[PDB]
RNA sequence: UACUAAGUGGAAAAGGAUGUGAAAGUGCUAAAACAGCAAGGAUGUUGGCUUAGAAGCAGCCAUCGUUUAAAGAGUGCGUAA
RNA sequence: ACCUCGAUGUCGACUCAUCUCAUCCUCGAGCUGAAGCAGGUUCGAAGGGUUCGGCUGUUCGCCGAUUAAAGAGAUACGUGAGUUGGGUUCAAACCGUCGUGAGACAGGUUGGUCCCUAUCUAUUGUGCCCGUAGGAAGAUUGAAGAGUGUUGCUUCUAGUA
RNA sequence: GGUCUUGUAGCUCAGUCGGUAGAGCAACGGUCUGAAGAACCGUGUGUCGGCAGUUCGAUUCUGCCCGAGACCACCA
């Protein structure tokens, strides 16, 4: 409950005065409260203080950092919103190009030469795009890496207004996104592991079996170094998969690398 | 020690013995050996 | 999967597979071949399972030929019905093979993989297959 | 016993070599000064698995198995012998074979050239 | 006169097999053939895609030569190669 | 559509259960991507046992809570000349539908009466005639046999490997 | 499961039914409008569900298939 959230924050205040090394984040998108711990015993003792020392009863789940969205090859559709809700007539209509841009975010290019759209409507329509990508038809993450090219439109009389054009552009963006087969991107962390000799094959087989992008060896002064661009989901239990196999003598560095295309298996897992 | 109906040598060692007039397939490993295959 | 174009009559005799090889009684286009030791009927599904097995174990090249094409068809009398209302409902197509008939031939990637592919093909059908080599 | 072939710029890389029982700085300095004339290049080394293992390490001249690319003035050693990648003059190939004649089982320049042709077979370029 | 080792006889197959016996052949060898054993079983060479290395041999693609009586980019097992 | 339409009593529930393993648990062993714990896997195999309730007339179904476990098939959907009849299937009535209406719906609803004096075989206990070679009185062994072959908890070993 | 009916423009419906695809609206251009809507004037869209046949050409006739819709489940 939200009251349970408040009481768990009180428990957080109690438990952070002893050792604040644990980090707590309340994600704005995934929503669930992430709290850091060392290992099985560390999380267990945190739970014990929560339920017995603090009398705080909270459910436990799984870490939450989900995705990003984008879409496939380009297309061009039109948006016509002739509607009204509150006392008079409303209308708007635009024509935009829905084109992907692999390495650039939202971009606008105008193609109004015959006066189909006054300059006053050039800027609002952009915003209509910038808010329309926020939802996806697969799982609802915002669509990025898109180049938008406005082509045409129609400004009518008093029935026309700027927010009507923004809504028409939103309709066009969603329709084109549905047509152009949207795809997903998963977070990918760059993990570097330095082991003298013991867990060469162990880490090789763990990465090959679980997930990750690997290429061979780095041979440091007296150790073996392996860097893997691996999905952030694969860190689940990896902290103890490596540590248990290393008897507690394992270490690495976790740095976020980039968002990468999600394979079909990930497409089947996350969807409801 | 598996049970099948068509024995074919999977590993290098897949020998057979009609021991006590009962056919057992044996291997150097404990997995590839068979019985009444 | 493999069916004739037009059928003047859809309802022939039930079928009898008795007799010896009348047509395609030998291998005449490959280098290795497969012969049936008993007359049977091969339906579309088993034929396609054998064909996909051959395709998978064939590699990148390999030449294969079936001596027959699925021509005959079968009918299914309605279930839970009393005796006598006509004939059955038309169903899957099928090919008839007689006792001692060569059905299939292979070349291109010789005898080792040839015999391997022939075993792969024959391990999908009830017929007690027999492998042979076409002699030139 | 294993085979090793690594950069001549420094003998410090290689944990397996240091774990045999020889001090890191020892073979590092020794190799780096024995290759001081020409280093910063790929060199095949050989060592044994000795118990005391004070120093039982030696090097060899630059390997000639795909080194014809140096003589062929190209890179990207071909996997398949389907097309030719370039041309090498026979004089240079024979001179290199003589240069490596003492190393191998070859007892005349011709046998070393036969081995060069055999190792060039995979590359797609032959002794031309 | 041959067969049996299953009580087959005295119910059934897809299947698989150094089961038994016979026949038709095909090669070498008493110099001691084959089995086993004492050994060797090598080099260019760690050939390249690549597993934050291609290395014999995860795999993949080529898929040769030198000495030898012998050694195959290897016959396989197996190793992080 | 082959005997039985000059008659093969059928639902469920209760009791009596028995038998089979094509085994659910308890037994043993092998393999294991089986460190142990925690599991799966295959074989031998019936010695045994395998719960209590709610909804439902009502098996099959679900759930609840339990045991170490909460298997199935066959016995005329075992089991009425063993018990009842909530049940389809009497006469009665009613709702909806259909049918000109009389009447009908694996649609529903309210209910609606199960006869048996036992001859033999069988089978369980209890007896009579005499037998086993003088009569009577005892002691007996034991042939095929009959009956039970279920399992859990706690603690120490030992927080030991 | 059959016993039937239906499948026609972008929606709803007719056909020398063996010799032609057409209506209202959906739908664009114009008229006009201090604002538009509305209204008016002209379009246009067309394997007649898919297959096969007969002949003469099958949208129609015959048969089959597919989708959907109406009727029933021995003993009543």
UniProtKB/Swiss-Prot annotation, chain A:
Membrane spanning stretches: none
GO molecular function list: GTP binding; GTPase activity; translation elongation factor activity
Keyword Cytoplasm attached: yes
GO cellular component, one term: cytoplasm
Compartment(s): Cytoplasm
Domain of life: Bacteria
Gene Ontology biological process: ribosome disassembly
Keyword entries, A-Z: Cytoplasm, Elongation factor, GTP-binding, Nucleotide-binding, Protein biosynthesis
Main location: cytoplasm
Protein's job: Catalyzes the GTP-dependent ribosomal translocation step during translation elongation. During this step, the ribosome changes from the pre-translocational (PRE) to the post-translocational (POST) state as the newly formed A-site-bound peptidyl-tRNA and P-site-bound deacylated tRNA move to the P and E sites, respectively. Catalyzes the coordinated movement of the two tRNA molecules, the mRNA and conformational changes in the ribosome.
Stated family: Belongs to the TRAFAC class translation factor GTPase superfamily. Classic translation factor GTPase family. EF-G/EF-2 subfamily.
Name of the protein in question: Elongation factor G
Taxonomic source organism: Mycoplasma pneumoniae (strain ATCC 29342 / M129 / Subtype 1) (Mycoplasmoides pneumoniae)
Lineage: Bacteria, Bacillati, Mycoplasmatota, Mycoplasmoidales, Mycoplasmoidaceae
Span of the entire protein shown here: 414 to 685 of 688
Curated annotation (Swiss-Prot), chain B:
Entries under PROSITE patterns matching the protein: RIBOSOMAL_L36 (PS00828)
UniProt-listed InterPro entries: Ribosomal_bL36 (IPR000473), Ribosomal_bL36_sp (IPR035977)
PANTHER family: 50S RIBOSOMAL PROTEIN L36, CHLOROPLASTIC, LARGE RIBOSOMAL SUBUNIT PROTEIN BL36C
Entry-linked NCBIfam families: rpmJ_bact (TIGR01022)
Full protein name: Large ribosomal subunit protein bL36
Gene behind the chain: rpmJ
GO terms for biological process, alphabetical: translation
Swiss-Prot/TrEMBL keywords: Ribonucleoprotein, Ribosomal protein
Domain of life: Bacteria
SUPFAM superfamilies: Ribosomal protein L36 (SSF57840)
GO cellular component: cytoplasm; ribonucleoprotein complex; ribosome
Listed Pfam families: Ribosomal_L36
Gene Ontology molecular functions: structural constituent of ribosome
Keyword Ribonucleoprotein: yes
UniProt keyword Heme present: no
Curated annotation (Swiss-Prot), chain C:
UniProt keyword RNA-binding, yes or no: yes
Pfam families (alphabetical): Ribosomal_L16
Keywords from the UniProt entry: Ribonucleoprotein, Ribosomal protein, RNA-binding, rRNA-binding, tRNA-binding
UniProt keyword annotation of RNA-binding present: yes
Any Gene Ontology CC annotation: cytosolic large ribosomal subunit
Database matches in Gene3D superfamilies: Ribosomal protein L10e/L16
GO molecular function: rRNA binding; structural constituent of ribosome; tRNA binding
CDD domains with a match to the protein in the record: Ribosomal_L16_L10e
GO BP annotation list: translation
Quaternary structure and partners: Part of the 50S ribosomal subunit.
Family according to the record: Belongs to the universal ribosomal protein uL16 family.
Function: Binds 23S rRNA and is also seen to make contacts with the A and possibly P site tRNAs.
Name of this protein: Large ribosomal subunit protein uL16
Organism: Mycoplasma pneumoniae (strain ATCC 29342 / M129 / Subtype 1) (Mycoplasmoides pneumoniae)
Swiss-Prot record, chain D:
Family as reported in the entry's similarity comment: Belongs to the universal ribosomal protein uL11 family.
Protein name: Large ribosomal subunit protein uL11
Gene: rplK
BP-aspect Gene Ontology terms: translation
Protein's UniProt keywords contain Ribosomal protein: yes
Functional description taken from the UniProt entry: Forms part of the ribosomal stalk which helps the ribosome interact with GTP-bound translation factors.
One family name in Pfam for this protein: Ribosomal_L11_N
Subunit structure comment from the entry: Part of the ribosomal stalk of the 50S ribosomal subunit. Interacts with L10 and the large rRNA to form the base of the stalk. L10 forms an elongated spine to which L12 dimers bind in a sequential fashion forming a multimeric L10(L12)X complex.
Matching NCBIfam families: L11_bact
Ribonucleoprotein keyword on record: yes
GO molecular function: large ribosomal subunit rRNA binding; structural constituent of ribosome
GO cellular component: cytosolic large ribosomal subunit
Protein keywords: Methylation, Ribonucleoprotein, Ribosomal protein, RNA-binding, rRNA-binding
């Amino acid at each position: 409950t939200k009251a349970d959230q408040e009481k768990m924050s009180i428990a957080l205040s109690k438990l952070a005065e002893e050792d604040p090394t644990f980090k707590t984040f309340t994600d704005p998108e995934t929503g669930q409260t992430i709290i850091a711990g060392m290992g099985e015993l560390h999380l267990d003792i945190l739970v014990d203080r929560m339920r017995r020392e603090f009398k705080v009863e909270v459910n436990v789940g799984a870490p939450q950092v989900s995705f990003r969205e984008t879409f496939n090859k380009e297309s061009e559709v039109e948006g016509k919103y002739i509607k009204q809700s509150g006392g008079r007539g409303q209308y708007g209509h635009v024509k935009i190009r829905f084109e992907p841009n692999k390495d650039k975010g939202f971009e606008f290019v105008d193609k109004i030469v015959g006066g189909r759209i006054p300059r006053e409507y050039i800027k609002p329509v952009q915003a209509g795009l910038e808010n329309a990508m926020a939802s996806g038809p697969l799982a609802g993450y915002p669509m990025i890496d898109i180049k938008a090219t406005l082509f045409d439109g129609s400004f009518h009389e008093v029935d026309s207004s700027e927010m009507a054009f923004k809504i028409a552009a939103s309709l066009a963006l969603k329709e084109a996104g549905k047509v152009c087969s949207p795809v997903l991107l998963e977070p990918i962390m760059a993990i570097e592991v330095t082991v003298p000799e013991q867990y060469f094959g162990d880490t090789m087989g763990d990465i090959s079996s679980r997930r990750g992008l690997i290429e061979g060896t780095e041979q440091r002064d007296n150790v073996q170094v392996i860097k893997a661009k691996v999905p952030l989901k694969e860190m689940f239990g990896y902290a103890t998969d490596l540590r248990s196999f290393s008897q507690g003598r394992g270490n690495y560095v976790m740095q976020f690398s980039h968002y990468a295309e999600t394979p079909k298996s990930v497409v089947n897992e996350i969807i409801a | 020690m598996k049970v099948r109906a068509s024995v074919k040598p999977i590993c290098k060692d897949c020998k057979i013995i009609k021991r006590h007039q009962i056919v057992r397939v044996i291997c150097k490993t404990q997995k590839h050996k068979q019985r009444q295959g | 999967m493999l069916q004739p174009k037009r059928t003047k009559y859809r309802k022939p005799h039930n079928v009898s597979y008795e007799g010896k090889a009348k047509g395609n009684s030998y291998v005449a286009f490959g280098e290795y071949g497969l012969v049936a030791t008993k007359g049977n009927w091969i339906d579309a599904r088993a034929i396609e399972s054998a064909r996909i097995a051959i395709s998978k174990c064939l590699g990148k090249t390999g030449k294969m030929w079936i001596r027959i094409f699925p021509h005959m068809s079968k009918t299914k009398k309605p279930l839970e019905v009393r005796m006598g209302s006509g004939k059955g409902n038309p169903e899957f197509w099928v090919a008839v093979v007689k006792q001692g008939t060569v059905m299939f031939e292979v070349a291109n990637i010789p005898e080792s993989q040839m015999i391997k592919a022939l075993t792969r093909a024959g391990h999908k059908l009830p017929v007690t297959w027999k492998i042979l080599k076409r002699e030139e | 016993i294993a085979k090793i072939n690594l950069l001549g710029g420094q003998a410090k890389p290689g944990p397996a070599l240091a774990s045999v029982g020889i001090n890191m700085g020892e073979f590092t300095k020794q190799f780096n000064e024995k290759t001081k004339d020409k280093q910063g290049e790929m060199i095949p080394c050989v060592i044994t698995a000795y118990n005391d293992k004070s120093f039982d390490f030696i090097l060899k001249t630059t390997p000639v198995s795909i080194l014809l690319k140096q003589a062929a003035k190209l890179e990207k050693g071909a996997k398949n012998a389907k097309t030719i990648v370039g041309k090498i003059t026979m004089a240079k190939a024979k001179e290199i074979a003589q240069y490596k004649l003492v190393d191998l089982n070859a007892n005349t320049v011709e046998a070393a050239l036969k081995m060069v042709l055999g190792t060039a077979k995979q590359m797609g370029i032959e002794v031309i």
